[PDB]
Symmetry: D2
Subunit: 302 residues, 4 copies
């Protein structure tokens, strides 16, 4: 019944919303959290992830992974990477095991029922895949936040997570594992408005205060009217996939240097005649989604 | 009147473009130049001459490039058939191409002009690129280039690329780096011009040589455009360029910095359009976003009726 | 006699090529076509006309492409410093070099050889503008490329680097190709004693040779003239048949001629690649041509 | 003299085995550990091969299994040169030893981090282990004294006209190493091809005898045919052992400092080492590139090491 997951992330404000949902909903069994460099350097995203788990009292092990992409000169986005909420001094620590080894070991010892949920650059995932290719058949599915079939964000062609490590993305998208891609085309619709925030503030508790603190800072909500929560859609998809419309496509990652480096090339119309390798997100029911967020928020209320 | 040189690879929608351009009082069609594309040049030349002969259009037609400037040639026979213009049946051809090569004609006409001519390429950009590199003095003489090509979203021939650009990406790179004012009627706009059966019946009602030819031509691309790209009618892509020159207020554009990707691989021939301006580069193209199809079909009927005798 | 069209971007050593081509009884120089390369076309044209005027070479000269077919133009640096020319009175023909190349090949009996010793822009455009010329070309003997180290970059020789897309056209044409690359041409080092010898021979061509090579010492190579040597007597130059591909990737090998020396790709050879030259034979030939100009 | 500490990373592999033999015996070298990577064959096979060599020569050095695949590209092997086992030729008794439990990448990281910066890495297969260690723990970069690697070519490659096998097998990994900023020495084909092991050379080592002599002959007789048929070589060069030679006495090898860039473009130069021989790019050199080797010196050294194992 519960879907077992390993959440790989680079917190990151909206990774934090993903952690919050994943750690609470009865439909999800969050086994571990693995951290990768992305939004910021690994030292920072690690601290950010540990801070979220400490504040929400989430008792799930957190593992540090790759501090660099597998080949390219490292890029970050844009002080911490998660300003807004107030955190107390960090007393919680990472596990000693490197995230790549933890991913490999856990998959190898499993009964093949674990789903990987990458919502940062794909560096940890790619290194685990090439270090121990025996994990490939043990992965049930990969539900990732990344890419765009239309316009990207960091460049016109590329979405940040893919652009941060295109060669790692190429590994994942050529793995043969069942893939689900929550790309910008879908995530940009899942718009957090002042009403959504007010709604979570009212529910309250640790999860409600955190969501609000993150999004009030991020959307500058004293002023003009909202913006997206990308990574959390992956969690939503696992809780109820009927809330998200997908389309099966053949997707290829462009690792050419030049104007399409890190692009996800999606064969929308099927002109290449190749078998589809990815379920690509098209539209989301935002009424359903926000209801789910509030639900997860309420799960933390003592 | 806007003076134009119409460069094309007829081609079903090319033929609609010719028909409009040759008739509307707002356009001064100086010449038609033919390039290889939808089919080989021998065929696109015959196709262009056949259209002009049937509609009694007395404009000179020049043969240009039979191959792209660098890549291995591809054709769009899956859409436009074996002849490149399946559907209508024409009388034996009495008229012929001029002796001057289209590239030389383009160069000479621009160089002798007062800088008021617009180029309207609706096939691969081979003729345009060769003319540009053979005589770079034409660049400041070109008022504007209004082209059918590219896509800021999904392509047709590949997921990344629209046929005209894919057929000669290096030529496209030349045009898009020329510094001349560019308007791009890409798939994102042109796909909105699907010509369904009721639209065909409209033009048959109008009648005359141009209504009959419109019907003969667009009935063929109904099946092909549906089977290949899932379209509810054969869009009429190339004619939107003529529409734009007649009244640009019918079409919404957005200024963007556009780059042509000439990398071999999954985005060869892609028009990369900076929709959101993330690169901080000055825009070099007016990119088509939406078209008022009520206005546009009215315009097509207007032009069709011009041929009633 | 081998009929040729000499396509060039003069250019100090292009000038030596013109001098040999226009005089030797084994060569029938039909026309000279000019391309941008060493310098912009305005300058290479003037340079070519200047050489023909001084040597009294009565061959028509045609202006061709002022830019490469796709890339941003590069030059190497008048583009022919050394000799002093009188005021220029010779003019280009009105016909564009690309049209002249097309027309001359189409009206020929298939016995003409193209000799490109600059960027390949004129050749590529003529090939794509009228593909019917392809079977009419007997051979193409070009100066360009390197199987080992380039000059302008580690990977690329200047003529190819100046228009890689044009080169890709020529090397995928199917026409018989001979490549005089840097690996061969760098061996043809003119020494002060080679110069002194052409000086002793004397006359206009000997003075020109001396003025050009006393300069570009500041020995050193004569690249483009090896193509003319090859046509006069191919036994002087050792070649090896290879499958050659032109890399048009942006990055560290843009414009590289990738030569399959050991045949590991299992593709049929498309190019006779120059390996070594007999410099004794070659310098003798240069002196021979110089003497053709004494009155 | 002072011993140079090394970690030998390899994909045995015929010349790999010669490299192990020299490294493990010469008093100028302190062989800390051997790490194995996929390359000549799949990792299962190159691991077995490496263990077999150590067992037969009684080399008591830990061996660690590393990357079974390159970091990004579709795997290729060199079975054309090395046979189906990856080390066709010699016979080996059943294994009574095994790989250590620690993954080679973690071992490389931990050993460098705990060192005093005096260890040299010697990669003579694809660079996959080295690249993953570098990106997993960038703190190892200043700990590495030097990297002396067999790979690349400034002229003609082998596997393709442009690329040498080790680089071609993992071009992205090579790009990591060549942009690391660590002092690099490149024993490329241009130098290593000069070490063709003709029959007279093998007979010389057979004359020397003992376990390393017999094994030298059993191993190098196999690449004689394969190197001729594939590449036109007069003997199986002994590429990987030149790296060990370089560390024993660098004066036996001439190098030239160059700026080297790895081409990761798909197409005809994928995996090429582009070497700026003439310095036309105006970039600082990042590699000492091998030009020529004194083969009289080098074969003397091989015999010296071979004679080391005589009982
Ligand atoms: Ca994230
Ligand atoms: Ca068209
Ligand atoms: Ca030249
Ligand atoms: Ca090896």
């Amino acid at each position: 019944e519960k879907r077992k997951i390993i959440l790989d992330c680079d917190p990151g404000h909206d990774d934090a919303i993903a952690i919050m949902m994943a750690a609470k909903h009865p439909a999800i069994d969050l086994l571990g959290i693995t951290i990768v460099a992305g939004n910021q350097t690994l030292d920072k995203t690690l601290i950010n992830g540990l801070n979220v788990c400490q504040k929400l009292e989430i008792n799930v092990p957190v593992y540090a992974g790759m501090p660099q992409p597998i080949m390219r000169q490292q890029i970050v986005a844009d002080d911490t990477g998660l300003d807004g909420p107030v955190f107390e001094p960090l007393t919680r620590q990472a596990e000693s095991t490197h995230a790549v080894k933890y991913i490999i070991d856990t998959l190898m010892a499993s009964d093949g029922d674990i789903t990987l949920v990458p919502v940062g650059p794909l560096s940890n995932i790619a290194v685990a895949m090439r270090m121990q290719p025996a994990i490939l058949p043990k992965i049930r599915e990969i539900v990732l936040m990344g890419g765009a079939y239309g316009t990207g964000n960091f460049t016109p062609s590329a979405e940040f997570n893919i652009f941060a490590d295109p060669e790692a993305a190429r590994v994942v998208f050529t793995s043969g594992v069942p893939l689900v891609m929550m790309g910008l085309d879908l995530t940009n619709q899942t718009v957090c408005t002042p009403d959504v925030i007010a709604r979570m503030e009212r529910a309250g508790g640790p999860a409600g205060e955190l969501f609000s603190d993150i999004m009030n800072f991020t959307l500058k909500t004293q002023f003009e009217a909202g913006g997206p929560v990308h990574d959390a859609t992956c969690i939503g998809y696992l809780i109820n996939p009927d809330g998200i419309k997908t389309q099966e496509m053949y997707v290829e990652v462009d690792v050419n240097s030049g104007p399409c480096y890190g692009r996800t090339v999606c064969d929308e119309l099927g002109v290449l005649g190749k078998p589809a390798n990815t379920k690509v997100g098209i539209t989301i029911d935002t009424d359903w989604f926000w209801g789910l967020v509030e639900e997860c928020v309420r799960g933390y209320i003592k």
